[PDB]
């Protein structure tokens, strides 16, 4: 509940594969938030995206609501987020930049799959930290 740093419904404008066969840079404008734009690289082989479809994009930290140092998948029967989401990526917000007054852009890298999120008032929710899960459902 309090682990979601961002959540919105986006209308996908463009989906173009630029010299790629399984990754597409989708462009999506928000619904009810006219200042909120979204550019996102998605594995369209696992999560196919077409033009002009509705995407629910949720940015969450601590998806699951030893000192082994190697990531371990959660148990199969674990009540967690991403159960109600088709496509989930894990990355890091590595840059915050201002695009104008009361409008900033936040950049995430999900292993090289980039995402640029544009908005105005999120200063108390989005931080430059490795803990950032991106959840998309259709």
């Amino acid at each position: 509940m309090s682990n979601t740093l961002f959540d919105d419904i986006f209308q996908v404008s463009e989906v173009d594969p630029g010299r790629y066969n399984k990754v597409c840079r989708i462009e999506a404008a928000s619904t009810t938030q006219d200042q909120c734009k979204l550019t996102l690289d998605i594995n369209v082989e696992l999560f196919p995206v077409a033009a002009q479809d509705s995407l629910t994009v949720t940015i969450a930290s601590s998806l699951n609501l030893s000192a082994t140092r190697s990531w371990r998948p959660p148990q199969a029967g674990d009540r967690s987020l991403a159960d109600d989401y088709d496509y989930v990526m894990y990355g890091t917000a590595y840059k915050f930049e201002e695009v104008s007054k009361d409008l900033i852009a936040v950049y995430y890298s999900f292993g090289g799959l980039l995402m640029r999120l544009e908005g105005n008032y999120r200063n108390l929710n989005n931080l430059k930290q490795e803990n950032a899960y991106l959840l998309i459902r259709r």
């Binding site: 594995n43 990531w71 890298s109 292993g111 090289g112 980039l114």
Partner: protein
Amino acid sequence: VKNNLLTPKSGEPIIAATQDFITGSYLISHKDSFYDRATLTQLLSMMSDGIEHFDIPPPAIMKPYYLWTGKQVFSLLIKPNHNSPVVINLDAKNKVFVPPKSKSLPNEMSQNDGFVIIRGSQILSGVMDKSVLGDGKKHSVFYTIL
């Protein structure tokens, strides 16, 4: 050899990746490259001699499958585990860099993977190019590690 990785004429690196190494690095770091856990661990074992510990990071894709990108593979190449001190921060342009769709957009929003960003030894964007792994560039990964 280790003390002479840079030519004294200009200081640019001269010992670096050759042709097939550059091609394989580019094919690994290519944005279409996704590896499951078994393939990733075999890649890391081949990268080492099977005698290096690797801290497997969380996969870039967590649903529907646990997939690692090739950029994560190369991030592990730079920094295999937490004991290794190599923390590299780098900004570089690949030799083929088509600019982002707008003049206002930052350089890593390039339409191709033409701009390399490395933060904390984590490759965030860009392919493993000749400008990043080859000779003559003072923004090379090996030049920075040196």
